[PDB]
Each structure stands twice: as structure tokens, then as C-alpha cells.
């Protein structure tokens, strides 16, 4: 699995450690091996929400299944709890974009997983 | 909706009110309440099109429905448009990847639009 | 088409020309002319691979039409391969999604490519 989180929170707003905590949460959450998990933050962007620019979060998480109706409103409630926790951002100015990747379209070392 | 627009113009070359005009103009484009438009603007970027580093811009246009072959080209004008006039990107120099998604693949306040 | 790049290997470990490689390689690769090619490279990330800070990349390919299974493999490959050459990154610590595009999905020029 792959999770991105851009975000207009400065760099040194996010704390130690976050990406190890979102690395864990999120293998245990999607059942993926930690190993498989992927984290990026990206913060300092220009960005609004609703057109505004107080504290909000533009996020994606990609994966080869583990991907549905019950199981992404279990992961939006764990992300945007650590979002507000960690990064004291609302959970109502986060969108979580979210994919099911097919095996064929996920390249990995020097191959795909189909 | 989330509008996300990715170029190697420099920061300062982007005008003020920018992430305001796009987010008004997509709330009336897209038909949907500004206060569910979020929109980010990443300036500064190593990128080529076409071979070169003369400004350019890869976009992203995500959407609950709203998304289609004659509203498409309706938004293309739109933001070709405004990145032109306001980043002076020349409009073939411009890629905005449509994505229709599905209310269950969209997270927001620790749930999905489902 | 477009590639994008994400990495957490420093902007002066990116090669001159290395945005020109990407782009020849991949017309030749997908058979398409250099001139609709666009490639992007974001380096200095904060992410993490499996856990791990060491040097990683999260990539896409967006194409209109050749994105297949065979296909893609031999792009992983390829670019697995110049990742690993240029910028130093080991093949199992890159992941790349990739797109196969509607032409109606892509805007450009003020239109789409439908
Ligand atoms: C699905 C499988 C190919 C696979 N994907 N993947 C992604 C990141 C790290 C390890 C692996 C991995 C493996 O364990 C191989 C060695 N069997
Ligand atoms: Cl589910
Ligand atoms: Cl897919
Ligand atoms: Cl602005
Ligand atoms: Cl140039
Ligand atoms: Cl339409
Ligand atoms: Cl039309
Ligand atoms: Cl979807
Ligand atoms: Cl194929
Ligand atoms: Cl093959
Ligand atoms: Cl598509």
C-alpha cells in the first residue's frame, strides 16, 4: 500500500516519528505485510479547502485490494484521527482519495505484482 | 472536488488570489458548493513537457460525478484558461488527468461521501 | 504521457539531463512522440519504504492507451533500471502505479483528447 499526505501544515509542525506511526497504523489497518507499506507527507503546500487556507490535508492511499466500502470509512476514521491528533488538522478538511489497484498496474522491483 | 496543479513556474509568479479564483470558478463549474472544493497549487517543480523546462503544468481534476467527455472539455477551457492568463502557461503545454470517483472511494470527517 | 517521480534522495543527486533521459526513454518505450511526453521529478521527500528512510521512490506512468500487462512490465524494468543507475535507489524500494487513461480523461490545449 501507498499513503500521501499534502498538506499546508509547516514542516516542523509535523512531529517525530509520524511517518513510522502511519507506517504501522496502516499495515495493520489494511492487513499488508509492513514491509509492502509505502508513507510520503508533503507539507508547507499551497493549498484551501473550501477556500480556505486554515489547516487541511489532500490525501491518497493506493492498494492491491483491501480497498472498500466498510474498509475505507474504517481508514478515514484512523486517518483523520491521527491527522487531527498529530498534525491538529480538522477531520472535516481532509479528503482521502482511495484506490484498488490491479496487480498488473503496480510495478515493483524491476517487475509488476501480477 | 480537488483540483491540484503541479508546474515549474516559480512561486512568486503565481498571483495573489490564485487558489481563490480556482476554487470560485470550479464551485461553478462543477456545480458543486465551494465549501466541498479544495484546490492545491505546488510552484517550483523540476518538470519537462515535450522535451523542454518552458513552463508547464500537470493537473488533476477528482470529482463525484460531474466528470464526462463534454463537461471535461467544458473545465479544460476553463483552467486552460486561467493558467495561461494568470501563470502564463501556454494552454498546449497543459495535462489535467479527469478522474470520476466513486462517493465510496472518497474519504472526509472520518467516514466517505458513500 | 506522464511520469512523475517522488524520492527522498537530495536534488543534487538528480543528474543534468536527467529529465531529458526520462523523456527519450520513455517515446521509445511507448512509441509516442517526445513532444507529448512530460516528466516530473520531486526529490528531498519525507517517505518511507517498508518502514525504512533509505533512498525509495513512489512513481505513475499516465498514458492514453499502452498500459498493459507485458507492457508494464517492461517499463518497470526500464525505469527500475535508470532509477537505480541515476539516482541510486534499489529496485525493491520503488513502486510505480500505473494509468491507463480514457482520452476523454485528458485534458489539453483548451479541450481533451477524445
Ligand atoms: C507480492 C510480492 C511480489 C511482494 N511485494 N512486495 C512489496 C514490497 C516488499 C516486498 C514484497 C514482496 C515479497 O515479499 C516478494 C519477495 N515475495
Ligand atoms: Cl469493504
Ligand atoms: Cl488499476
Ligand atoms: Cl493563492
Ligand atoms: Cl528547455
Ligand atoms: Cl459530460
Ligand atoms: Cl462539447
Ligand atoms: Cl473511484
Ligand atoms: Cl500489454
Ligand atoms: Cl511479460
Ligand atoms: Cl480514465
Known sequence: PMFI???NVPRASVPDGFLSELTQQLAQATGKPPQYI???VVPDQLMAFGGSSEPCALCSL???????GAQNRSY???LCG???ERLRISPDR?????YDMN??????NNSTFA
Chains 1, 2, 3 share one sequence.
Not at 493506493?62 to 472498500?68: A, M, R
Not at 481532509?94 to 482511495?98: D, K, L, R
Not at 496487480?103 to 515493483?108: K, L, R, T
Request: zero cysteines.
Open 76 to 78: 478515514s476514521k484512523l
Open 103 to 108: 496487480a498488473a498496474n503496480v510495478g515493483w
Open 82 to 84: 491521527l491527522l487531527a
Open 62 to 68: 493506493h492498494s492491491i485490494g483491501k480497498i472498500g
Open 5 to 7: 499526505v499534502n498538506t
Open 38 to 40: 509505502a508513507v510520503h
Open 94 to 98: 481532509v479528503y482521502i482519495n482511495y
